[PDB]
């Protein structure tokens, strides 16, 4: 089987991958922000929206991923398990889940429709040769 | 925060934990049932249910778990192997993923409410002496 966590929301993995990695904030900064704003909504008994329903599972899934990454990097007596877990987290799943947190939090702050257009706008800007774009890349607001 | 993934769906971690860990099918079977019933709906871009939105996310991050497992057995010496990491996973979050997959799939097949009422009745039924219960077990259907 094969699923795109973004398809049901009107985006894809490729649309987010077209953003540069350094653009997304850290896993901890996103987690902090997700609490401060939607602490109350996330811990509620009402699916506030499919964005809330996705954000709860994603956040909990990542903690499962992080428990495993901890066990593998600490309790394997092979020393290369450190570098393998650091690589796995940076290279692979940390950035994949940094995008996912950012998408659903921004859809909740600026609305799904606003956020999507910002992707496509960012998409032309990056694809555009530098002397032909504005020095500042696009920016998200209401 | 502290997010119960069952709370927006009327249940709690303790209610799923109220059934014996023997009871929930392997993660592999549940994926097969999930792909055999809601493949096209889960891959659909249509939000089909808050259960759908949540099932999609659980499916993908079981894969992120097994992907890490693979790295360890591939990139490290064979005493630390994929079989070791996976044995760790299934000991840990393995049941947690079986309960989730079951709850959300079985909530799609039968009514959600059917499932919740089953959880309590089946849970007490297996705990009751044969002499002091009805002979026929609480069951799920429509
Ligand atoms: Cl971080
Ligand atoms: Cl392109
Ligand atoms: Cl008991």
Author numbering:
A (entry chain B), B (entry chain A): 1 to 142
What do the study authors state?
Cp149_Y132A crystallizes in three forms: (A) open triangle, formed by trimer of dimers, (B) closed triangle, mimicking the three CD dimers around the threefold axes of HBV capsid, and (C) spike-contact packing (discovered in this work). However, a new space group was discovered during our crystallization screening of Y132A mutant. The packing in the new crystal lattice, termed spike-contact packing, generates three types of interfaces. The type 1 (spike-to-contact) and type 2 (contact-to-spike) interfaces are formed by the spike domain (G63-G94) in one dimer and the intersubunit contact domain (G111-C terminus) from the symmetry-related dimer, with a contact surface area of 856.4 Å2 and 414.8 Å2, respectively. The type 3 interface (contact-to-contact) is constructed by the contact domains from two neighbouring dimers packing in an upside-down manner with 332.3 Å2 contact area. The novel apo structure suggests that at high local concentration, core protein dimer has a tendency to associate with each other in different formats, not limited to triangle format. Interestingly, during our photoaffinity study, we identified Y88 in the spike region as an additional label site for both R- and S-configuration HAPs. In the tetragonal crystal, Y88 is in the vicinity of the compound-binding cap from symmetry-related dimers. Especially in the type 2 interface, the pocket may accommodate either of the HAP stereoisomers. As core protein modulators may trap capsid in different states, the spike-contact format or upside-down format of core protein packing may represent one state of the total ensembles.
